[PDB]
Write an enzyme that holds these catalytic residues in place. Structure first.
Site, short mmCIF file in Angstrom:
data_model
loop_
_atom_site.label_atom_id
_atom_site.label_comp_id
_atom_site.label_asym_id
_atom_site.label_seq_id
_atom_site.Cartn_x
_atom_site.Cartn_y
_atom_site.Cartn_z
N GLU A 164 0.66 -1.26 -0.10
CA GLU A 164 0.10 0.11 0.43
C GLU A 164 1.17 1.56 -0.03
O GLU A 164 1.31 1.22 0.70
CB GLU A 164 -1.21 0.13 1.43
C1 LIG Z 1 -5.57 -9.37 7.82
C2 LIG Z 1 -4.49 -8.75 7.69
C3 LIG Z 1 -4.61 -7.73 6.49
C4 LIG Z 1 -3.46 -6.70 7.08
N1 LIG Z 1 -3.52 -6.19 5.44
C5 LIG Z 1 -2.41 -5.40 5.34
C6 LIG Z 1 -2.04 -5.02 3.86
O1 LIG Z 1 -2.58 -5.74 2.35
N2 LIG Z 1 -1.21 -3.93 3.38
C7 LIG Z 1 0.14 -4.34 4.30
O2 LIG Z 1 1.31 -3.28 4.22
N3 LIG Z 1 -0.33 -4.84 5.61
C8 LIG Z 1 -1.37 -4.84 6.07
N4 LIG Z 1 -1.35 -5.54 7.08
C9 LIG Z 1 -0.71 -4.86 8.31
C10 LIG Z 1 0.33 -6.03 8.41
O3 LIG Z 1 0.44 -6.97 7.97
C11 LIG Z 1 1.44 -5.97 9.51
O4 LIG Z 1 1.20 -4.57 9.62
C12 LIG Z 1 3.27 -6.30 9.62
O5 LIG Z 1 2.70 -7.87 9.00
C13 LIG Z 1 2.70 -5.88 11.21
O6 LIG Z 1 4.26 -6.61 11.42
P1 LIG Z 1 4.74 -6.87 13.17
O7 LIG Z 1 6.55 -7.81 12.88
O8 LIG Z 1 5.15 -5.72 13.83
O9 LIG Z 1 4.41 -7.93 13.44
P2 LIG Z 1 3.71 -9.29 13.53
O10 LIG Z 1 3.34 -10.21 11.63
O11 LIG Z 1 2.80 -10.45 14.37
O12 LIG Z 1 4.83 -10.19 14.30
C14 LIG Z 1 4.93 -10.29 15.79
C15 LIG Z 1 5.53 -12.08 15.27
O13 LIG Z 1 5.50 -12.22 16.96
C16 LIG Z 1 4.98 -13.71 17.35
N5 LIG Z 1 4.41 -13.44 18.77
C17 LIG Z 1 3.57 -12.86 19.38
N6 LIG Z 1 3.70 -13.62 20.89
C18 LIG Z 1 5.56 -13.58 20.99
C19 LIG Z 1 5.71 -13.95 22.48
N7 LIG Z 1 5.00 -14.02 23.09
N8 LIG Z 1 6.78 -15.32 22.25
C20 LIG Z 1 7.29 -15.17 20.94
N9 LIG Z 1 6.79 -14.99 19.49
C21 LIG Z 1 5.51 -14.07 19.79
C22 LIG Z 1 4.07 -14.05 16.31
O14 LIG Z 1 3.23 -15.49 16.31
C23 LIG Z 1 4.79 -13.37 14.81
O15 LIG Z 1 5.59 -13.95 14.11
C24 LIG Z 1 -2.56 -6.34 7.73
C25 LIG Z 1 -2.47 -7.45 8.31
C26 LIG Z 1 -3.42 -8.39 8.52
C27 LIG Z 1 -3.10 -9.60 9.41
#
Ligand SMILES: Cc1cc2nc3c(=O)[nH]c(=O)nc-3n(C[C@H](O)[C@H](O)[C@H](O)COP(=O)(O)OP(=O)(O)OC[C@H]3O[C@@H](n4cnc5c(N)ncnc54)[C@H](O)[C@@H]3O)c2cc1C
Ligand SMILES: *[C@@H]1O[C@H](CO)[C@@H](O)[C@H](O)[C@H]1NC(C)=O
Length: 467
Positions: free
Chosen positions: A61
């Protein structure tokens, strides 16, 4: 091996990014503990009816703008991941009446244009608000201001248009969303208004993997990450932090020591009781955690014996103007993305997501059939042979899909969210300054959190002043 040790909680986008930035600076003594059996987090594909579809993020996006979206080169040039530009110019022709058939295009067009103008004045207003957030308001309050009414879009057509404009982007109604932090939106202001639908059988997660295999040791033959520094199925349950160092305990009773911990778990996980902090995190931090929103965006997939829906120019996205706001409203057909698949995609968010996740797939399929018969009467619409209802909210490791900036939370207390507490650092989309809720936001937040710590570990400067 030699130097400070950092434990990264979670191998999502920001988790992988952060450790990559840490490695690069010299901090190579990393341990990534990942709760699930795979890296990627909310970038995750799955097999639905013999094809691979995304459960989570599905778009890049912000493309074609004034600044390069860091994920776009990786997607389009480096991995050459199959993707398609989404065009919304034809929604006017594709808004379905609650009972039977589409609305007069010319009518729907007026409403769309009107909606767009109210939002444009939102931008003007938002551009004048003080940066302290003192005079911020909800998107609805603005809408009311312009439309001179006690209420926002109240009629079936108007609402589904309203839903599509906002809910479909932020996964919560305008009335809970901050005007000053979504209208306009840096993701689009900076990287362009275009969004690109990744439909590549490798998964959008391939980006995470790509990044991960630039510092983590992979098997020369298979390609699988073999680095002992990444541990899957490791569920962090307790973080102990003191002036001296940090303890990280996992669910299988392993206890780890390190100089610093980088927490990349979602806002929802932080909001849950999954990770206990000893001692308890300061009030200021707790209040920041619980005032921000962890929204739910549910991508319901359906497969059909045959194709009963219109295909062709401007037919990809269609709306269902239900009188019950947010009821199975936004639809996507995949003639381009998955030719000859017979899969439709309906999106629900927020209040409806919570209901739907809690109910049997059958009960849901039932409701959706009903709607689909109403949208296409005098067509013979076959029961969906398969349904997919992603249950992100229900999942303890996610507790949502992405963060939304809510009215009340100002820029300062948003910064309290990203702020570290002692040797406990935070990262993830929800810590991203201008791109919370997005893949790039997560990606860039990894880098920023990393750099904050690196500045402390190496440069020996660790007072973080919240702004
Ligand atoms: C339905 C949906 C659609 C979306 N649409 C868009 C889109 O299309 N375009 C876009 O740009 N973004 C979109 N997003 C948002 C985007 O996916 C997120 O901003 C990004 O993936 C977040 O990554 P993160 O590392 O911040 O979090 P996460 O990907 O959640 O990383 C956290 C990790 O920590 C792990 N975990 C959590 N608790 C613990 C713990 N206690 N111990 C060890 N591990 C743990 C989890 O398993 C996970 O792998 C969407 C998200 C969803 C799910
Ligand atoms: C993506 O790649 C295509 C085909 O190789 C190329 O023509 C184009 O420059 C890229 N598209 C965008 C939007 O960057």
């Amino acid at each position: 091996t030699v130097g400070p040790r950092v434990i990264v909680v979670g191998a999502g986008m920001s988790g992988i990014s952060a450790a990559k930035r840490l490695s690069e600076a010299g901090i190579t003594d990393l341990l990534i503990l990942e709760a699930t059996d795979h890296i990627g987090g909310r970038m995750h594909k799955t097999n639905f009816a013999g094809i691979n579809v995304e459960l989570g993020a599905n778009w890049v996006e912000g493309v074609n703008g004034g600044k390069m979206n860091p994920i776009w080169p990786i997607v389009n040039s480096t991995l050459k991941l199959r993707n398609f530009r989404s065009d919304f110019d034809y929604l006017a022709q594709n808004v379905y009446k609650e009972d039977g058939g589409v609305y007069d295009e010319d009518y729907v067009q007026k409403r769309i244009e009107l909606a767009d103008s109210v939002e444009e004045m939102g931008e003007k207003l938002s551009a004048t608000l003080h940066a302290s957030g003192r005079d911020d308001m909800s998107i609805l309050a603005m809408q009311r201001l312009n439309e001179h009414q006690p209420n926002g879009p109240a009629t079936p057509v108007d609402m589904v248009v309203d839903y599509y404009k906002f809910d479909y982007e932020f996964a919560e109604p305008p009335r809970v969303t901050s005007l000053q932090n979504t209208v306009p939106l840096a993701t689009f202001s900076d990287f362009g208004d275009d969004v690109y639908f990744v439909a590549d059988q490798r998964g959008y997660e391939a980006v995470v993997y790509y990044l991960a295999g630039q510092y983590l040791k992979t098997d020369d033959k298979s390609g699988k990450i073999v680095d002992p520094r990444l541990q899957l199925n490791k569920v962090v349950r307790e973080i102990k932090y003191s002036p001296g160092g940090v303890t990280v305990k996992t669910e299988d009773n392993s206890v780890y020591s390190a100089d610093y911990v980088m927490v990349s778990a979602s806002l929802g996980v932080l909001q849950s009781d999954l990770i206990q902090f000893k001692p308890k995190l300061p009030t200021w931090k707790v209040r920041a955690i619980y005032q921000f929103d962890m929204a739910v965006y549910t991508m319901i997939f359906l497969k059909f014996p045959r194709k009963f829906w219109p295909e062709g120019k401007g037919r990809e996205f269609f709306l269902y103007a239900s009188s019950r706001r947010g009821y199975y409203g936004v639809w996507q057909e995949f003639e381009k993305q998955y030719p000859d698949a017979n899969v439709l995609l309906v999106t629900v968010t927020d209040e409806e997501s919570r209901r739907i996740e809690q109910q049997s797939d059958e009960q849901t399929k039932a409701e959706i059939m009903q709607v689909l018969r109403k949208m296409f009467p005098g067509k013979d619409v076959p029961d969906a042979t398969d349904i997919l209802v992603p249950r992100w909210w229900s999942d303890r490791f996610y507790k949502g899909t992405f963060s939304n900036w809510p009215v009340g939370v100002n820029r300062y207390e948003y910064d309290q969210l990203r702020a570290p507490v002692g040797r406990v650092y935070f990262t993830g989309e929800h810590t991203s300054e201008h791109y919370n809720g997005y893949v790039h936001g997560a990606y860039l937040s990894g880098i920023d959190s990393a750099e904050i710590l690196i500045n402390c570990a190496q440069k020996k400067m660790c007072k973080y002043h919240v702004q």
